[PDB]
Design a protein around this ligand. Sequence first.
Ligand SMILES: [Cl-]
Length: 213
Amino acid sequence: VIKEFMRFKEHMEGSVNGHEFEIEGEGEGRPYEGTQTARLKVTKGGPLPFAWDILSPQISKAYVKHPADIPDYLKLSFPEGFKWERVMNFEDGGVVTVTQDSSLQDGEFIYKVKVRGTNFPSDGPVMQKKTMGWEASSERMYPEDGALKGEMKMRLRLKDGGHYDAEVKTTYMAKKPVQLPGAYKADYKLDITSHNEDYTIVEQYERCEGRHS
Ligand SMILES: [Cl-]
């Protein structure tokens, strides 16, 4: 059911520091090569009053290149699919938590996402929009408690020139008990490839590849 080319559709709804929004997206990629692009639009509550960059990693692990000998748990979860839940703790006390459902219908991946951001300082780089995308990330993947966990430190580049840091923990759970992998790493790079002024229209590109640790 996972072809060498696959599209996806995404609906995200959320709030950050009280500001409500919805985003719709359509994307496409090559799941066995670890590569994907997407076009996204803010459909309600745009222009966003905070950094797009805190949303970009919430907006697709079906598209991770896996060697032969690492069970690709997330592809094997389809057509039913998988749920994930995440928390990002940012250095200045900001917090993002995400709940997500992924499935496959009519030959395309369907993503349904709920995002809540809170406690970001008003004078911070997130509410002031002073960020400049993510550095490459390596996610520590390991089985625990019948689910696949991931942990990562992410570094958001700052326009003034430093970095702004977040510690991340996610639980990924297939809807049927398909084969969990052993411990490994997933190397990411995510790039914003286009945005309009106010970031109500945004394109992204991501590559991700798994490897033994
Ligand atoms: Cl169908």
